[PDB]
Scaffold this active site. Structure first.
Site, PDB file in Angstrom:
ATOM      1  N   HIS A 134       0.852  -1.180   0.000  1.00 39.49           N
ATOM      2  CA  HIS A 134       0.000   0.000   0.000  1.00 39.49           C
ATOM      3  C   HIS A 134       0.890   1.232   0.000  1.00 39.49           C
ATOM      4  CE1 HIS A 134       0.593  -0.109   4.465  1.00 39.49           C
ATOM      5  NE2 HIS A 134       0.359  -1.397   4.304  1.00 39.49           N
ATOM      6  N   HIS A 166       1.228   1.438  10.596  1.00 40.02           N
ATOM      7  CA  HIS A 166       1.821   1.177  11.902  1.00 40.02           C
ATOM      8  C   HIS A 166       1.878   2.445  12.736  1.00 40.02           C
ATOM      9  CE1 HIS A 166       2.723  -2.630  10.152  1.00 40.02           C
ATOM     10  NE2 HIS A 166       3.532  -3.015  11.121  1.00 40.02           N
TER      11      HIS A 166
END
Ligand code: VO4
Ligand code: VO4
Ligand SMILES: [Ca+2]
Ligand SMILES: [Ca+2]
Lengths: 590, 590
Positions: free
Chosen positions: A472, A479
């Site tokens: 992506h 994260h």
């Protein structure tokens, strides 16, 4: 009123509150349409700055057909499964076996299949809590020609070159040559030596870093990450183990009490070992142009990384990259919450029933207690992820740092082969001449180790992961959005101002915790910010994320968590608020 | 329409869906006001069958003041912090020091303070996701005079007497005497030998257990909890470790691959150790009447339990009790999810993008992937907890199994001292004769070990925990409700029908996983039901919950999870459903 209608009106009130925050418009940097095909007779966009991983690439890392990227964007916006499946993912496939024809011998011998875009339309997914994935926004990503991108990719390259360097020995003379080289290279960049000018976007000013020193090298800018040892306590140290409770006037000591200082978290009645799997030192990935191009063409290299036997507390930069490689979404924060609960770190005193039960007659588990924070820190993650997925796919589509390093490497190889390509990364190529020279030496060593006796001079960003980045766009960071959301939840819930009396570091020689030489004080908020920065910058040290994705998605996750907390506050009838110190130093009451 | 308006309408539609299922009326057993003061001239309710723990008790375990329990109920229903704090929690306090005056020498020497009711009004908390805490209902808890309560308390007493017996050795000859005694005792009870009669409530028929065999002794009634080894794989076995992935035609093997069969879950890049802290074998708690009464008077004995050095995989019944003692809310289910993810157990095939990326061009992490299930299995827990807290405090207020054991013990001691008290537990005392004799032997041994040279004959239920039960009513069970909700989430999300090829048990002689002799096949759904069974019955093996609390809380939790999933499905634009095998044996599509 009826309890059913009361619940319905509470949910409608939370939805109305989410509506009332409004939709912050999401602005991209314009790089999607800015850079065109260098062909003198082709005006189509090159999309070199856009996340084009998976779509077929030319030998230079540029898309073969811009229609592929346009259809990819259409699929992102529609979200339809059929239209996503209709996308051209990977290179041309072999007519005989149906397997994609890979440019590298490595991916062909492995018979690697293509890997798909991970949730290209998760940003279209709605949420019953928090801001909508599209309501809150991220600032425009740094442009390739910007000095911010230069500094970002320089930090990425230096992190890759320093992946074997241990955190406790950033100041040590054994790493002094590399550390001073990285410090002086970053401080030679406009983004670090020259401050923000008046008229810069508020986010550009806010995320701009000052002079790089050994104390803030590869560190964050959230409050408390730059103070103390590099790694957060919650990522290396364990927790008070079962049996070490205080029972009236008598204190029992756990027979396993040493596990707190052995990096073992009391995960209920079982234990979580903070020790990370040891990724093979010096083994970087996508350092060869053919393998890098295959990865750009969706070569599913996931799981190809080699690991050393056993586990150890995070010491090297590669160790933090490995930690952030596989962490189970909310792993770092859930572990931080487990440590804070086992260590008996008090919840926010503004939460109800937090007094002694002699006074309030009420313990807290489900609400304002252990279960409440454990559930909040874990549920905030998926909604922050939906928000960041919107930012990645529908808004910014920023190319990954591996893709930037590919543009940089092709640009630097072009004069050697006699051409000139990717003038967009010209500033990056010239401003990082010495960093790119060290990266070329490292990539030559890796490609010799990979199997090429005489590897083509490659300036690709070394990748801690075989697949490189997740599939992506880099901006924002999933994260780091989970970092912002979950650390925000923990700071709001726990007494984030509580100081940590015992500060630990990983021993420079052994695999154990040692009392840190840091003579200052670390707070729970400070160390939680340090943990969020640790995960985010560990994404940076993997080569999979720039620093702006990190910090701005940390802010985005903090916003998502603030929205979630503000909505859940409408569900508790108790008079209370969350004292939440935000990443800007301000405290909000929720 | 507007994306903000679409988010608002999606949330309001989810709220409408929750409102449209309706509020299932919650019926109690009528135990609260059924049993009155044994005093000939006092008509007040005794509240002996009600959860009165924390309120002052007389020497017999009955409440001193019925107005105390009535105020407790008023505070539960209101939820006000001031009204909860105005409750009389604990016994009369010492005027000089302010510490509560404890009946037992142990609690006085320890200078224990009172522990408060944990979330007496968490059921009043609203939820933005899933059914309201008061929207779903549990059936009435079995009354004390019922044979169901007799069977429940008999199972609890046998579990307490069999706490040092290993699960892998239920069929072993060394434990054969106890196992056969427990089997013959349970099969001598009406609830186990006599089947449900026509006209019984559907919940009583559903939760009625048949003949107790060694294959179902201390097991659940969930589908798959009766087949295979006693413990679920997910509570003992580890997971595929980092480095053991498949990369095209090449299968990489983790250098730490043995950790899967050493009870280590690949928790991201770090590891979760399935080994539980070893509670002191044979150390039972609340076996003396004075300590039991102090615990009923809110003696904060939390953390007073002793533990052995190190950790081991769950082998003994006390090991499972210890495991469910401290588990972090969703810990069992989160660990099961982590094992399923690391083992590559496929998600529901009806989820989108679960195909190979060559076909769908889409990996799943945020939506229908690892992050989605990890977040769902953790957010469902607090919602189920709010529902079960409503059931505990506002509806049933069932006395804990420790309180039932106290009533039974006082009833069995009264004829020995020439009195007669608690004819409500007369049937339990008569039917549990041999079990109560063995429990008296065990309690006398424990109270000798506690420090009483000649302890009063005690028939109290031995407790694995020093504080015994948590400070909420037994019906329903919070651990069982979280088990139902989270295991339901996992079954809906993962392909729960996949068979587990490798089935393990804890070795009879060593602390290691051995291949199970089970020649049948265990499904993912079966082992998840077994895990919910293991957590819930380990709560029973703690002495803190009966079997009915367990099963009906599992059912309620499944209802919570179904509601949450139904409202989540309104948020995903993808065409998909969750194939969910319910505990009913039916499959619902969400
Ligand atoms: O979006 V990320 O690779 O953290
Ligand atoms: O409600 V519990 O003590 O599982
Ligand atoms: Ca309290
Ligand atoms: Ca797929």
């Amino acid at each position: 009123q009826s309890r059913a209608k009361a619940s319905f009106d509470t949910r409608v009130a939370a939805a109305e509150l989410a509506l009332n925050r409004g939709v912050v418009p999401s602005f991209a940097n314009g790089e999607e349409l800015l850079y065109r095909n260098p062909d003198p007779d082709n005006t189509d966009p090159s999309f070199i700055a856009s996340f084009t991983k998976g779509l077929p690439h030319d030998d230079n890392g540029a898309i073969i057909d811009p229609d592929d990227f346009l259809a990819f964007v259409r699929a992102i916006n529609s979200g339809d499964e059929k239209e996503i499946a209709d996308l051209t993912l990977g290179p041309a496939r072999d007519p005989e076996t149906g397997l994609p024809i890979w440019r590298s011998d490595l991916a062909n011998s492995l018979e690697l299949e293509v890997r798909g875009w991970e949730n290209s339309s998760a940003g279209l997914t709605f949420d019953l809590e928090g801001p909508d994935a599209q309501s809150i926004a991220m600032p425009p990503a740094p442009v390739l020609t910007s000095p911010e991108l230069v500094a970002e990719i320089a930090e990425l390259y230096l992190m890759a070159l320093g992946r074997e360097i241990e955190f406790s020995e950033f100041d040590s003379p054994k790493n002094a040559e590399y550390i001073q080289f990285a410090i002086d290279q970053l401080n030679g960049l406009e983004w670090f030596n020259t401050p923000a000018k008046l008229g810069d976007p508020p986010a550009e000013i806010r995320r701009r870093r000052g002079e790089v020193t050994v104390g803030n090298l590869f560190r964050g800018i959230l409050p408390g990450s730059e103070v103390g040892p590099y790694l957060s306590q919650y990522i290396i140290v364990g927790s008070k183990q079962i049996g070490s409770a205080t029972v009236g006037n008598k204190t029992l000591v756990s027979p396993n009490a040493a596990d707190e200082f052995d990096g073992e978290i009391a995960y209920g009645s079982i234990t979580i070992s903070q020790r990370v799997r040891i990724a093979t030192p010096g083994r970087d990935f996508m350092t060869d142009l053919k393998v890098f191009l295959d990865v750009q063409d969706a070569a599913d290299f996931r799981g190809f990384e080699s690991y050393e036997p056993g586990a150890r507390l995070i010491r090297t930069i590669r160790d933090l990259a490995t930690w952030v490689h596989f962490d189970a979404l909310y792993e770092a924060y859930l572990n931080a919450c487990l440590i804070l609960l086992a260590n008996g770190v008090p919840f926010d005193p503004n939460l109800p029933f937090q007094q002694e039960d002699k006074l309030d007659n009420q313990d807290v588990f489900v609400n304002f207690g252990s279960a409440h924070v454990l559930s909040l820190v874990t549920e905030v993650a998926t909604r922050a992820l939906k928000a960041v997925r919107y930012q990645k796919f529908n808004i910014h589509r920023r190319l990954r740092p591996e893709a930037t390093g590919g543009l940089i490497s092709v640009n630097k190889i072009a004069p050697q082969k006699g051409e000139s390509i990717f003038p967009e990364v010209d500033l990056a190529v010239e401003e990082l001449g010495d960093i790119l020279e060290k990266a070329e030496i490292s990539n030559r060593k890796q490609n010799i180790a990979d199997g090429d006796p005489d590897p083509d001079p490659s300036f690709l960003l070394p990748m801690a992961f075989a697949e490189g980045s997740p599939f992506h766009p880099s901006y924002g960071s999933g994260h780091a959005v989970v970092a912002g959301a979950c650390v925000t939840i923990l700071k709001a819930f726990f007494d984030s101002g509580i100081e940590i009396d015992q500060v630990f570091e990983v021993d420079k020689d052994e695999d154990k915790l040692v009392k840190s030489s840091f003579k200052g004080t670390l707070t729970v908020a400070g160390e939680l910010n340090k943990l969020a920065d640790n995960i985010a910058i560990g994404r940076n040290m993997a080569g999979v994320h720039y620093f702006s994705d990190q910090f701005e998605s940390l802010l985005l996750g903090e916003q998502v968590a603030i929205g979630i907390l503000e909505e859940q506050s409408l569900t508790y009838g108790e008079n209370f608020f969350f004292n939440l110190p935000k990443f800007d130093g301000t405290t909000i009451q929720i």
